[PDB]
Structure formats: structure tokens, C-alpha cells
Amino acid sequence: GNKLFNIAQRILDTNSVLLTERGDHIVWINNSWKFNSEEPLITKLILSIRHQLPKEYSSELLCPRKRKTVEANIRDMLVDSVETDTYPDKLPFKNGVLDLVDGMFYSGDDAKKYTCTVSTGFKFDDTKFVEDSPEMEELMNIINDIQPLTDENKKNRELYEKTLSSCLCGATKGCLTFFFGETATGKSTTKRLLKSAIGDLFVETGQTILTDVLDKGPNPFIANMHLKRSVFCSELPDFACSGSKKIRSDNIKKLTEPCVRNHATIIIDTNYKPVFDRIDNALMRRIAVVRFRTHLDGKIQNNRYRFAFLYLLVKWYKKYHIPIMKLYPTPEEIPDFAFYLKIGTLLVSSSVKHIPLMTDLSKKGYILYDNVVTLPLTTFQQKISKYFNSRLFGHDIESFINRHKKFANVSDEYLQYIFIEDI
Amino acid sequence: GNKLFNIAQRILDTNSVLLTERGDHIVWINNSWKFNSEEPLITKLILSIRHQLPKEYSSELLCPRKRKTVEANIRDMLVDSVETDTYPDKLPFKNGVLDLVDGMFYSGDDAKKYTCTVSTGFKFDDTKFVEDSPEMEELMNIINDIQPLTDENKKNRELYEKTLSSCLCGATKGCLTFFFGETATGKSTTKRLLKSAIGDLFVETGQTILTDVLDKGPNPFIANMHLKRSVFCSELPDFACSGSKKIRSDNIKKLTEPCVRNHATIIIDTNYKPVFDRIDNALMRRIAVVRFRTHLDGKIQNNRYRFAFLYLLVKWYKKYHIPIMKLYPTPEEIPDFAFYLKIGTLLVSSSVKHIPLMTDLSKKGYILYDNVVTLPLTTFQQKISKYFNSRLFGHDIESFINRHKKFANVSDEYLQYIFIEDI
């Protein structure tokens, strides 16, 4: 056999080139995984790899024709595709990868076992990443001041922790966090703090994507989120005042779908209660709200506590986080949302069980027209007005009636729903 | 004579490369058929098959130039052309193919004779596939609880069994199926079972990109379904309220025929009565409805019932399904159709034989217009009111008279339809 095939076999044995599902080849150089298409990097690896080879095989990887032949031989013997960006339990660095399972830092060729195409953008240091230090002593007071240790907030505190516990674990988390508070309440103190802790992956924006459809075109806002670990909405549109675009909805549902991969959590800071275009029953299944009831900079700007802040995060991924990543929505604390569940509980549509009960509802004023319960117009309106405060609620009631004006005819105005309290 | 020519002849004799009359060659490598729109794979196949040859025709199969020469010789020996995915009774797995008419599993080169370019995405095994297991016992318990064998539901049960087994998943089948019943009655539980049974080939979609024209723009759905086996609509209540789009009948006609391969069954399931933009001839033929009126847990997540669902399906296919996948419509239980069927039966276009019979209709007050028998305007609006209630059927009557009226000159509009109930 010729020497070129043996050299190619040896290079493949020292596995450094992999084939992706897109048909491109990824190479291992400079302790990093390079993935490129316009510039072939195979020959560059061939030139550098010659040092750790027998001298007889060496001194031949100099004429470009030999390197081209070796590259062709390597390319012709790769038939199995592999997947990238797996193990959603470790995070990369400029010098290796840190595993959350045991807090150990793979470095050098140990990183080859993980196909991580991104990095935190800065070097990793084991120093200052300890459970006890002067920075360790001077910390966990800002959080306690910002997050009270009271029992009623304690669970909320855990929920407040949970977001950061899910901040870096990327498994296409569909959930929305709403940090509610006011000025100088410490909510902004955590702002950009993760940028000190994580960096590079931390990205923030305003309302540009909050009031528009991401499918508008090939904007960068639908390109960078494919690999970002987390995102953070900022600013205060103040939906209440005139001129706001309210909420462009279903964008959250669209982004919940993987691809079009996506592993960035979304956090929105608000000093006011938001106003939405509409409400769908699935919306309460994703959004959560965390409040703050409380109300020096250069040191954080120096990023002294970069490794120190990571340790309490590690403890938080130890707590309530190892088995599952699940985020539990809390629609109860969301205003303009309790009304929807209240009217849903008190009002039901045509079900299987009401078939005999119409016989009773006939004496309740419910006509049995079209084999369904029909209530005379404005009768339900006055019933609700007696069972509610009207005013702001009454406007929402009228809006819901307009949205669901289930009228068979223009002359025949009725409601297809059934009053629970009528029973 | 020429060693490379003999090698190419032997490789062709192995029957591993085929032409697909589309400018591309399919290659049988890694126990699977792969296309050639990617980088050429013939050289990879040659390098792989290298071993199964004499050493004399093995040593020189290392230089890329000789491999390219052999490939060029190989390309000149193909003048024929074969199709892909022709047999409709085969279900392709990752490690083999399952027969449906008989019941047997190929695994390896035995399955090479079948040209299938798709797979379920999961490897198939005889273990947990046979009967007499706790999983299948739970399986009949579940399907008997959800679908009782009562005489009321016996037709519903038989249509439901047919619809699941209606997917031979190998040929284009029309008659878009419909599922209606009470929600939260195990109807939604079956979609996860179907997802487990099918795997990657199963795709479900909600009401999105459905109420509009699917053909406009290069939509991914029309691009991917060419080699898909089962795609059906998700369970969503119909948007019959204010500010809601309607169901376009042109899309049904577009999807009922293969694109210029629609070998998939389309099912629309919901617990809410749909509404219709327009009606026309044969549209009731392409719709079939199965009632779901009649009314586990973590075992669905671990797909422990993934297997044995296929023995249920194949037993259904053996049960009265093997004489063709012909479907039958059920438009009786659909609104906007009963009155349409009645007016179709009660009215017929007048012919020459009805010309003298007009004299009898002359006793009823009908007047001939343009020396041809017809129905004068306003002389039948009250006639229809006798047969059908004005309040509900008046909108349908006015819509029909606005759509189809054969509006002639002023005071000469004519209706070439007679009443068979009167005569």
C-alpha cells in the first residue's frame, strides 16, 4: 500500500475531522472546533499534524499535491454523520468546558469529546471559583436585600432563583419570566450582572421584537438566537399610555418551536402591568411573574465576582434542578388574567352533561332553540353586572361578547354558554 | 483486458448503484439507500466494497485517480431507469422493512430489493412486538374504554378502525377524514400513540396555514410531504366567532390530487362544529366523519405501548381493508349539507320530457319565459317557506339565489329547475 493511504488512516485514527448533517466538515485546530465552508481547513490541519508522526511519513506533507491526495483519501472514507451542540448540562469556555454535574473543568483534548461550536469568549480560571473567599463573604448580601428572606417571598425567592437555575440549561425552554418592581428596587442590579457572569451569550434588546413578527424577513434577530444561551428584554414601553403597540401575540408560541437549537431564556423587566392584544388559553401555561418589594458599581463593572457569582448558581442547579428543568407558570399574580379564568369557571359552553339539565334550564329562562341553551340578549349582561363590578370589568365583558357573538341570526341574539351559578 | 473495466463490471454485478431517471444515482451504503444530490458517493461506495474482491483487484483501489476512472467507467454502464417507493404494502424501518399483507421483517441485504428512501427513524425488533404482554392488555383495555363496542358506536368504532388502518401509507388517498366528539374523552390521547407508532414520518399541524391557500409561495409543507406517510390536522376548536377566516374549498381540491407524491391520509379532528365558506358538487364525497361522542398517564411518555399498536393496525388491515383503500363519505352528520342534499333531490334541471308537464305546472301559476320551461321569480320563495323554516333556511335560500340564478334580461330571469315533490 502507498504511504498516503496509511497517513490518511493514521490521521483519521487521531480523530479530528467530523462530518455534519449539512454535508460540511468540522476540524479540530488550535484547541478549538472550526467549522467553515468557503475556506477548506483540511489541508491546514494536514500541515500542522505532521509533527506527531514518524519522520519517514513526515517530509512528504510538503508538496501540495500530496496534501491534496491525502485530503481526498480522508474525504472518501467518512460516511457517518454526527450531531453538534449536545449535552445540555455543560458550558464552554475559551480554554475548555465546565460540567455542571460535578463542577470539573475539561481542558485541552478533553474538550474534543464534546462538539461545542461556541464559547463564553474569555479564559476560564479555577482560582476565585471557590465556595469560600473574601468575595464570597461580601456577596449573598445584595441578593438577600433585593430578595427578602420572608417565608411568603421565600418560595417566590426560589422561583426567582429558578429562572437563573434555568438561565444556562439549554433544552428549548418555553417560558416567559416577568420581573416586576420599580426604580432603584434592585431589579436593574441583576441586569447586565449575568453579562459579568456569562458574557458573550448575554444579549438584551428593547421592544423591537416585542411588537413585531419575527417572520418579517432574514433579520439578525432570527439568526443569533439559534445559539444564544439566554436573552433579556429591556426598556419600558408603557403600554397604558397612548401610542403603544400593545402586544404582538403568538410570537412567543412561534419562538417556542425549536429551530427556524434555540435555547435562550427570555426575561422581561416591567415597572407597570402590561396590556395584551388578546388572551389564548395556552398563554397562562408559559408566562410567570416575579415581584420585588424592596428598594457599589465599579466593583461589579470590574467583574471581580465573575467566578464567585457562579458558585451560588452551581448550588442552585444542584437544588430543585438536577432531575427536571420544568418551569411552572403563575397566572394568579398576573392582573387582567384572573378575570379570564374567573369567567371560564363561572361560564361553560355546550358539553355532554347538560343534555338533561336543559329540562331544568327551561325554567331558568334558557330557551331550547336549535337543541342548545339560548339566553335572551342583555339578560346575561345584567346577570354579570349583578355578579361583577362592571366598569373596567364591564368593558372586558363587552369585548368578550363582541369576540364571541354567537348569534344565529341578526334578529335572534343569544348566548350558547351555560351559567354555572344557574345550577 | 483492462483491470479497471473488470472491477467496474463486478461492482455493477453486485447491483448497488441505481439510476432514478432524474440525473442522480442512488447508492446502497451503510445498509441504506442514499441520494447523490450531495457530494458524489460512488467513490465512497467503492472504497467500502474494496474488501469483497481479490487482492489483485484490491491493492490498486487506493489512488484517487484510479477510483475516479472506475467511477467514470461505472457511470457509462447505466442506461436504464427505476422508480423509488413503488410498493405500497411495505413499512420501512431503520434496520429493515416490515411487510403488511403477510407479516414478516427483512433486515439487511435482503431488504435491498425494496427501494425505500424513508424510515420510521427507530430500529425494529421482535421483542415486545409479540402479543401476551402487560402493555397490549392495557392497550385493548384503553381502546375498549375509549371506544365501546355498543350498537350505537359500532359504526363509529368500525369507521375509527378503518381510518387508522386507512393509511396504507403507500399510495395517494383522498376523502379527507373528520373526527368529532366530546373533548377530554381520550380522543387526544391517540395522537401520541400514532406519533410513537409512526415516528419521524408522523407530522401534525394546527389551524395555521390551513384556512388560506397553501400553494402560494414555496411553503415547507408542500415541499416535505412528497415523501411523507401520515399528516393530519391537530385538535383545535373551529374559528367560527367574529374576526375569523373560513375554510377554503379550493385547498381541498388541490390536496385531493398528487402534486405535479401525496401518499398520506389527511384527518381533521375537533370537538367544535366547523363552518363552511361555500359548497359545490362532489365536495361531500371528499369528506368522511367519524363520531367520538362516547367517553395511560406516564406510560405514554415512555412509549411502552409503541409496539403491539402495529399488530392492532395490521389486524385491522387484514380485516376487510385489503380489498383496496377505498373510502366512503359521511356527509349526513355535517351542517350546510342536509338542506343541500334535499334541494338536490327535490329539484332537477328540466328536460324535453318536462316540456308538456309544464301544462300541469301551468295550473300552479308557473309562466314560461323565452319559450322555454322555467320557474318565475318570487313565485317560489313562499313555496320554499312551506317546506323549510324561514328563520334558518332563508339565509341559505337567498345565498343560493344570489349565487346561481341565471339572471336574464330585466323581468326575464329564469330558473331551469322543477319540483319533483309537487310533480
**Residues of chain B contacting residue A409, judged by C-beta atoms under 8 Å apart:** 391-392, 395
Nearest chain B Cα distance for residue A348, angstroms: 13
Segments in B147-188 forming alpha helices (H): 151-166
Which residue type occupies A423? I
**Residues of chain B contacting residue A23, judged by C-beta atoms under 8 Å apart:** 38-39
Nearest chain A Cα distance for residue B43, angstroms: 7
- From chain B, which residues contact A within 8 Å (Cβ)? 29-30, 38-39, 43-44, 47-48, 59, 62-64, 67, 182, 240-243, 293, 295, 391-392, 395
Q: Do B48 and A79 touch (CB under 8 A)?
A: yes
Q: Please name which of A97, A111, A105 lies closest in space to residue A30, comparing C-alpha atoms.
A: A111
Phi, psi of B97, rounded to the nearest 5 degrees: -140, 140
Nearest chain A Cα distance for residue B199, angstroms: 17
Residue in the block written with cell 333531490 = B345
Nearest chain A Cα distance for residue B204, angstroms: 13
**Residues of chain B contacting residue A80, judged by C-beta atoms under 8 Å apart:** 30
Strand pairing category for B267-270 and B176-181: parallel
Beta bridge partners of A104: A99
Strand pairing category for A176-180 and A266-270: parallel
**Stated length of chain B:** 423
**Residues of chain B contacting residue A412, judged by C-beta atoms under 8 Å apart:** 391
**Among chain B residues, CA nearest to A69:** B64
Beta bridge partners of B288: B177
Q: How many CB atoms lie within 10 A of CB B106?
A: 18
C-alpha cell of residue A417: 354558554
In whole angstroms, what is the distance from residue B379 CA to residue A144 CA? Answer: 85
In whole angstroms, what is the distance from residue A241 CA to residue B283 CA? Answer: 51
Q: Do B64 and A80 touch (CB under 8 A)?
A: no
In whole angstroms, what is the distance from residue B110 CA to residue B123 CA? Answer: 16
In whole angstroms, what is the distance from residue A200 CA to residue A214 CA? Answer: 22
Are the C-beta atoms of residues B135 and B128 closer than 8 Å to each other? Answer: yes
In whole angstroms, what is the distance from residue B149 CA to residue A174 CA? Answer: 41
In units of Å, what resolution does this entry have? Answer: 3.3
Q: Do A1 and B59 touch (CB under 8 A)?
A: yes
Please give, one letter per residue, the 3-state secondary structure of chain A. Answer: CCHHHHHHHHHHHCCCEEEECCCCEEEEECCEEEECCCCCCHHHHHHHHHHHCCCCCCCCCCCHHHHHHHHHHHHCCCCCCECCCCCCCEEECCCEEEECCCCEEEEHHHHHHCCCCCCCCCCCCCCCCCCCCHHHHHCCCHHHHHCCCCHHHHHHHHHHHHHHHCCCCCCCCCCEEEEECCCCCCHHHHCCHHHHHCCCCEEEECCCCCCCCHHHCCCHHHCHHHCCCEEEECCCCCCCCCCCCCCCCCHHHHHHCCCCCCCCEEEEEECCCCCCCCCCCCHHHCEEEEECCCCCCHHHHCCCCHHHHHHHHHHHHHCCCCCCCCCCCCHHHCCCCHHHHHHHHHEECCCCCHHHHHHHHHHHCCECHHHCCECCCCHHHHHHHHHCCCCHHHHHHHHHHHHCCCCCCCCCCCCCCEECCCC
Size of the A and B interface in Cβ pairs below 8 Å = 45
C-alpha cell of residue A290: 416575579
**Among chain B residues, CA nearest to A23:** B38
In whole angstroms, what is the distance from residue B219 CA to residue B235 CA? Answer: 22
Are the C-beta atoms of residues B113 and B33 closer than 8 Å to each other? Answer: no
Q: Please name which of B106, B129, B177 lies closest in space to residue B333, comparing C-alpha atoms.
A: B177
Nearest chain B Cα distance for residue A52, angstroms: 24
Angle between helix axes A3-13 and A42-49 (nearest 10 degrees) is: 100
Are the C-beta atoms of residues B364 and B376 closer than 8 Å to each other? Answer: no
**Residue B349: its H or E element:** strand B347-349
B contact test, residue of A79, A249, A412 with most B CBs within 10 A: A79
**Residues of chain A contacting residue B32, judged by C-beta atoms under 8 Å apart:** none
Question: In chain B, count of helices (H) and strands (E)?
Answer: 14, 13
Question: In degrees, to the nearest 5, what angle opens at C-alpha A119 toward C-alphas A117 and A120?
Answer: 160
**Residues of chain B contacting residue A1, judged by C-beta atoms under 8 Å apart:** 59, 62
In whole angstroms, what is the distance from residue B284 CA to residue B302 CA? Answer: 40
Q: Read out DSSP for A81-132?
A: -B--S--TTEEE-SSEEEETTTTEEEEGGGGGGS------SS---STT-SSS
Q: How large is the greatest C-alpha to C-alpha distance in chain A, in angstroms?
A: 102
Q: Read out DSSP for B93-106?
A: -SS-EEETTTTEEE
**Stated length of chain A:** 423
Q: Please name which of A276, A1, A227, A279 lies closest in space to residue A118, comparing C-alpha atoms.
A: A227
DSSP secondary structure letter of residue A374 = B
Which residues make Cβ contacts (< 8 Å) with residue A308, sequence separation at least 6? A128, A129, A133, A135, A136, A139
Breaks (C-N over 2.5 A) in chain A follow: 260, 295
Q: Do A76 and B62 touch (CB under 8 A)?
A: no
Strand pairing category for B97-99 and B104-106: antiparallel
Phi, psi of A220, rounded to the nearest 5 degrees: -65, -20
Residue in the block written with cell 392584544 = A277
Strand order in the sheet with B32-34: B17-19, B25-29, B32-34
